[PDB]
Design a protein around this motif. Structure first.
Motif, PDB file in Angstrom:
ATOM      1  N   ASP A   1      33.406 -24.658  10.650  1.00  0.00           N
ATOM      2  CA  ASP A   1      32.459 -25.463   9.889  1.00  0.00           C
ATOM      3  C   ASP A   1      31.077 -25.434  10.528  1.00  0.00           C
TER       4      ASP A   1
ATOM      5  N   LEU B   1      29.446 -22.356   9.378  1.00  0.00           N
ATOM      6  CA  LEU B   1      29.064 -22.298   7.971  1.00  0.00           C
ATOM      7  C   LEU B   1      27.902 -23.231   7.662  1.00  0.00           C
ATOM      8  N   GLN B   2      27.814 -24.366   8.357  1.00  0.00           N
ATOM      9  CA  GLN B   2      26.646 -25.221   8.191  1.00  0.00           C
ATOM     10  C   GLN B   2      25.368 -24.458   8.514  1.00  0.00           C
TER      11      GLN B   2
ATOM     12  N   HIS C   1      25.004 -23.638   4.500  1.00  0.00           N
ATOM     13  CA  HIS C   1      24.599 -24.896   3.881  1.00  0.00           C
ATOM     14  C   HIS C   1      23.180 -25.287   4.276  1.00  0.00           C
ATOM     15  N   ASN C   2      22.854 -25.198   5.558  1.00  0.00           N
ATOM     16  CA  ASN C   2      21.552 -25.671   6.013  1.00  0.00           C
ATOM     17  C   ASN C   2      20.449 -24.710   5.581  1.00  0.00           C
TER      18      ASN C   2
ATOM     19  N   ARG D   1      20.457 -23.107   2.845  1.00  0.00           N
ATOM     20  CA  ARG D   1      20.293 -23.462   1.443  1.00  0.00           C
ATOM     21  C   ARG D   1      19.326 -24.627   1.286  1.00  0.00           C
ATOM     22  N   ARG D   2      19.571 -25.714   2.017  1.00  0.00           N
ATOM     23  CA  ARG D   2      18.874 -26.964   1.751  1.00  0.00           C
ATOM     24  C   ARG D   2      17.498 -27.026   2.394  1.00  0.00           C
ATOM     25  N   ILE D   3      17.260 -26.258   3.458  1.00  0.00           N
ATOM     26  CA  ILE D   3      15.940 -26.248   4.077  1.00  0.00           C
ATOM     27  C   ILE D   3      14.966 -25.418   3.251  1.00  0.00           C
TER      28      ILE D   3
ATOM     29  N   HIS E   1      15.665 -24.347   0.037  1.00  0.00           N
ATOM     30  CA  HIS E   1      15.955 -24.514  -1.383  1.00  0.00           C
ATOM     31  C   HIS E   1      16.357 -23.181  -2.002  1.00  0.00           C
TER      32      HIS E   1
ATOM     33  N   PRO F   1      22.533 -21.093  -5.137  1.00  0.00           N
ATOM     34  CA  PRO F   1      23.847 -20.485  -4.916  1.00  0.00           C
ATOM     35  C   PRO F   1      23.904 -19.086  -5.507  1.00  0.00           C
TER      36      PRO F   1
ATOM     37  N   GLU G   1      26.639 -16.969  -7.493  1.00  0.00           N
ATOM     38  CA  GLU G   1      27.915 -17.090  -8.182  1.00  0.00           C
ATOM     39  C   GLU G   1      28.799 -15.882  -7.896  1.00  0.00           C
TER      40      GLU G   1
ATOM     41  N   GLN H   1      17.387 -21.557 -11.047  1.00  0.00           N
ATOM     42  CA  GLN H   1      17.896 -22.484 -10.049  1.00  0.00           C
ATOM     43  C   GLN H   1      17.311 -22.234  -8.667  1.00  0.00           C
TER      44      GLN H   1
ATOM     45  N   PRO I   1      12.128 -27.676  -6.726  1.00  0.00           N
ATOM     46  CA  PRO I   1      11.687 -28.795  -7.568  1.00  0.00           C
ATOM     47  C   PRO I   1      10.451 -29.464  -6.985  1.00  0.00           C
TER      48      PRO I   1
END
Ligand code: ZN
Ligand code: ZN
Ligand code: ZN
Ligand code: ZN
Ligand code: ZN
Ligand code: ZN
Lengths: 361, 361
Positions: free
Chosen positions: B266, B269-270, B274-275, B277-279, B281, B284, B286, B354, B358
């Motif tokens: 984990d 993978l963070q 995941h991180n 992705r969110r830092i 933006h 995903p 598919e 996507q 935003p």
């Protein structure tokens, strides 16, 4: 006018009360979609509670049949099921521990029972705890003794957020969520609500508690409604259950805070999309998004249209922002006060190939 | 045997040198896919550098034509383009500031130039900084004066990670990444590599630097290779450029650390999914995933098969773990030493609906 496109938002703490008069999956997920929420995690304190494989199997079929948005179901820790959930654990959102007052099948009567669950629940799957005041420190100790992470539900007090802050400064793997009623309500509102309606666990905090949560926004990983729909008949009765409905008011309240500069749009999306994804390993939702109007001023009425709770503690508050449209996996799910996907359109995300939690073989 | 399915991994710091002898998008993204990486963010210090709209337009078409995996392109801050990138900023991965020695078009000669970029770059888009030693503290000051976030590239020293740790304890919006050569190489290896090959910026740290990064893993948001492919001819020459190739060795090295219990799956993978992705933006992907074999023992050879650098500083190190198969958006992209998607299969994720960041209207 001039709408903003958001990703599909995620609420990791809702009580949908199925297996119904309070709420069911159909009406609860309708309230969710009207609040800009396309995926929810349902808690296990239902009747019967989700504390073993047959109960989860039943709940999964009821949600698959009633849910209008996608979902995952929590398993509940009990005094007897430690070490028995290994085969179904991966199919659940995670394990929920109720460490404070519950007087239900989820009551744990000893910290040794907490450790047994931390020791037997698969180490790669999420564990979530309802832990108030000193209980937060106690469950963090158990998490350290068992060398794993924990997620603390609805932080509501200066005391709790500061301890989590101190744990994170020490590098401990703890994450936490906060509910809207602990950011936008305080003791100053109990006069209006009364002791029957204002009953919630964790209880409403002081103005200092609310200010502390806002000041320590950097410590909050997630927003989650803790949607606990109880009818007005129960909240105003002799022994009123705790909890507020909040799926339909969460996003409008937080968008109001964004328009006031209290937090940024990114801050909001981290806590209602990205962090829920990565803490609970929830998969993306393709062709899914929410359209909000940030200019619309309105007042929260006596009750929101969808939740069967038929009341809200945010009545009268002035908000800026409204959900105009929700698209879920390629279909218009919600538009201006109407839900357009039937019960059963929602799916259990843990059954998706990308929704399984990766683990070492 | 017994493979593990991972999501599509993301490397937010690569130099693909197009607009070529060192590397191009086709060969660089091949090395990426062989390393389990399905999306990369390319840095702007190319020739010509990506520091204005025409250069970005060109680079975007070259990547769309050569890239085998998905990507986003960074814009580069210069002494002259502050306040000129507003119309194309949203099409880039973010803004890259080179605050240390570069002697290129990206050289900034005053901290006032840093502020002008923090003040003019759209506040909702990522800013990334190459900042070493005290420069990390300086850019954090600029970020505070301009009331916005910053992401610090390749943290390599105890000094740097402890300051970031202190900033995060104060609630400041800072995130950071670390490269594999600063987790698995130190001064103890410079004897073997020599001063020509061992040239990298940030330079290799002491054993104490490496131990500090591992001890403060909780402070590291992302792993990123800082893929800087230079030929052996340049690394061993008179004025050798800095940087290592690392796309093909990043995941094997980190999977080795996981098998040794140094960090969890984990944790990995963070920091590689995941991180990032969110830092930044990032959207995903598919029907995208990576299959790794965690049991396979092998030794890193003199050079990995795909990168045009034709050398690696991890030569001889024993690793446990290998990428067996990569599927990118429904197509087998890589399998056991063969890339099966042509140049141009990759897409610019910022053009996806996507993949846009935003913002408030
Ligand atoms: Zn269904
Ligand atoms: Zn609770
Ligand atoms: Zn609850
Ligand atoms: Zn292409
Ligand atoms: Zn750099
Ligand atoms: Zn670099």
């Amino acid at each position: 006018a001039k709408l903003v496109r958001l990703p599909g938002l995620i609420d990791v703490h809702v009580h949908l009360q199925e297996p119904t008069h309070k709420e069911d999956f159909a009406s609860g997920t309708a309230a969710a979609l009207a609040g800009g929420i396309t995926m929810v995690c349902a808690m296990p304190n239902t009747r019967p509670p989700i504390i073993d494989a047959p109960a989860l199997a039943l709940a999964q079929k009821l949600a698959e049949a009633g849910a209008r948005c996608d979902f995952a179901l929590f398993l509940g820790a009990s005094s007897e099921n430690a070490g028995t959930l290994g085969t179904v654990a991966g199919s659940a959102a995670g394990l929920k521990l109720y460490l404070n007052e519950t007087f239900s099948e989820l009551r744990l009567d000893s910290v040794v029972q907490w450790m047994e669950h931390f020791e037997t629940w698969p180490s790669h799957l999420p564990i979530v705890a309802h832990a108030e005041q000193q209980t937060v420190a106690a469950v963090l100790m158990v998490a350290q003794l068992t060398q794993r992470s924990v997620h603390i539900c609805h932080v509501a007090r200066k005391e709790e957020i500061l301890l989590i802050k101190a744990a994170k400064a020490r590098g401990l793997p703890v994450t936490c969520e906060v509910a809207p009623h602990h950011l936008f309500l305080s003791h100053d509102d109990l006069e209006r609500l009364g002791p029957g309606k204002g009953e919630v666990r964790p209880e409403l905090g002081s103005r200092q508690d609310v200010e502390a949560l806002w000041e320590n926004m950097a410590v909050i990983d997630c927003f989650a409604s803790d949607h606990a729909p109880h009818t007005l008949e129960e909240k105003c009765g002799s022994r009123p259950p705790p909890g507020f409905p909040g799926l339909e008011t969460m996003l409008p309240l937080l968008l109001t805070a964004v328009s006031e500069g209290r937090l940024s749009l990114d801050d909001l999306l981290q806590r209602l999309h990205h962090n829920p994804r990565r803490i609970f390993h929830l998969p993306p939702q393709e062709d899914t998004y929410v359209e909000v109007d940030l200019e619309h001023e309105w007042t929260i009425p006596s009750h929101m249209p969808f939740s069967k709770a038929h009341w809200t503690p945010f009545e009268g508050q002035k908000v800026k922002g409204t959900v105009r449209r929700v698209v879920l996996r390629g279909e218009v799910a919600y538009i201006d006060g109407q839900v357009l996907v039937p019960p059963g359109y929602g799916q259990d995300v843990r059954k998706w190939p990308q929704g399984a939690v990766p683990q070492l073989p």
